[PDB]
Amino acid sequence: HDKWEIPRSEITLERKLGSGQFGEVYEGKWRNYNIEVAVKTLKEGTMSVEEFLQEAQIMKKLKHPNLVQLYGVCTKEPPIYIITEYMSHGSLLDYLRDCEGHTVNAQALLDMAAQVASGMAYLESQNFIHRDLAARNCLVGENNVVKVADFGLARLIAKFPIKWTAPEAISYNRFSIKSDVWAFGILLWEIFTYGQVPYPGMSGSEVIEQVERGYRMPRPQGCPEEIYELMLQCWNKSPEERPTFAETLHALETMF
Numbered sequence: 237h238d239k240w241e242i243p244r245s246e247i248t249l250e251r252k253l254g255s256g257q258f259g260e261v262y263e264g265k266w267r268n269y270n271i272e273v274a275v276k277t278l279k280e281g282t283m284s285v286e287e288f289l290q291e292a293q294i295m296k297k298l299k300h301p302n303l304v305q306l307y308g309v310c311t312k313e314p315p316i317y318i319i320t321e322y323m324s325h326g327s328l329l330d331y332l333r334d335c336e337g338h339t340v341n342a343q344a345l346l347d348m349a350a351q352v353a354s355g356m357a358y359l360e361s362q363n364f365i366h367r368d369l370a371a372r373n374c375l376v377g378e379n380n381v382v383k384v385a386d387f388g389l390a391r392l393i394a395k396f397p398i399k400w401t402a403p404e405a406i407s408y409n410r411f412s413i414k415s416d417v418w419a420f421g422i423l424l425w426e427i428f429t430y431g432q433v434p435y436p437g438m439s440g441s442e443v444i445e446q447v448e449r450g451y452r453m454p455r456p457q458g459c460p461e462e463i464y465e466l467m468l469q470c471w472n473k474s475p476e477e478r479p480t481f482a483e484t485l486h487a488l489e490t491m492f
């Protein structure tokens with residue numbers, strides 16, 4: 237019924253970007269300003285409107301230069317659309333692996349890691365928990381602005397992927413901003429290894445076991461001691477002795 241409602245006539249849709257698990261993506265064009273957009277769409281026997289849109293409902297309440305921006309929605313009838321700013325280099329994961337991002341230096345990696353921090357710190361200070369933070373869920377636009385995306389599992393103040401999830405969250409579903417910091421830790425590993433998959437080789441059953449028992453991935457060669465020292469900080473056995481996003485950010489802004 238509401239104020240973010242965009243008429244469907246106004247959006248075109250020009251090409252496909254994403255798969256069909258509950259609905260695909262597509263680049264489109266918003267005719268009334270001649271700007272590109274990402275349209276997320278809903279495969280029609282699934283989810284429920286409510287469950288699709290809470291991702292929107294969260295974005296409605298956010299404004300920040302490293303948080304992908306909601307333009308609006310077409311819930312007038314099906315398929316449901318969630319319209320958002322188009323990011324010209326796709327997931328951070330991809331960017332690091334392919335387009336340009338493969339061949340860049342450690343200062344590039346750092347400053348793109350600070351933008352994620354910056355966005356997260358804003359979420360922190362607004363009492364939000366993302367819950368699904370990783371490189372695949374971060375996007376890239378022009379001049380390598382990096383933004384944070386996917387607020388599907390986001391909340392104010394349940395299934396999951398083992399390797400980005402903190403041991404307390406795995407064992408007890410105690411999820412919090414500090415579990416989000418754990419993930420940032422993993423993200424950092426991903427960045428500084430030009431998009432590698434974490435805990436190489438291990439089952440995911442091995443990982444639950446090993447990390448609850450104290451194990452942490454070794455420093456990978458390429459990565460500034462400084463940064464590795466910071467990963468470990470985010471991987472602190474105990475939630476409440478991990479940095480705030482505030483502190484994390486500040487750290488990154490120091491450093492050669």
Ligand SMILES: Nc1ncnc2c1ncn2[C@@H]1O[C@H](COP(=O)(O)OP(=O)(O)CP(=O)(O)O)[C@@H](O)[C@H]1O
Nearest residue numbers: 253254255260261274320321322323324326327372
């Ligand atoms: N707003 C946006 N702008 C530009 N590209 C986007 C975008 N949203 C998604 N994409 C691109 O399409 C991909 C689709 O991501 P999405 O989460 O929709 O499906 P997916 O195939 O990646 C399954 P998963 O959620 O496990 O990553 C992204 O990784 C990204 O490259």
